[PDB]
Ligand binder design. Sequence first.
Ligand SMILES: *[C@@H]1O[C@H](CO)[C@@H](O)[C@H](O)[C@H]1NC(C)=O
Lengths: 49, 50, 50
Amino acid sequence: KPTTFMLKYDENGTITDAVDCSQNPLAELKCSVKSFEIDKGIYQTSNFR
Amino acid sequence: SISITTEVMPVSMAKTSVDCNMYICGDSTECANLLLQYGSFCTQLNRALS
Amino acid sequence: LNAPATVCGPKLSTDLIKNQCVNFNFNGLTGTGVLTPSSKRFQPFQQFGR
Ligand SMILES: *[C@@H]1O[C@H](CO)[C@@H](O)[C@H](O)[C@H]1NC(C)=O
């Protein structure tokens, strides 16, 4: 299906981690911040729903 | 004499936030694809407003 | 995209879908949104409003 993903490339040219922006609100937050590590607090997200 | 006088001072203003993707390309997939080419510009305004 | 369209194209029509984010096509005016009934009144022979 046509979906939105975010991928991480390491120091050897391979894919090591990925996330789907339409699955969970936490994953949507990760896709909005564009990082895998997020801190304590409240954020505002985009519409990948 | 005893005089009471008043002084008015502003303290805060309204807090606002803007959704960049729905302001620029409203419900358009093609415009969304063309907007990702302009990288890390919509994430620079949300930081300022926060 | 000014008046009622009198000469047109060979496309098949489709039944209406209500209250769902679907891609509409009204006389070549493509878009994406949800469809609701209306209580607005139009001028005669005027197609759409902005
Ligand atoms: C990947 O890159 C790192 C750092 O450049 C290097 O040390 C390593 O040998 C490379 N290959 C693998 C298989 O990790």
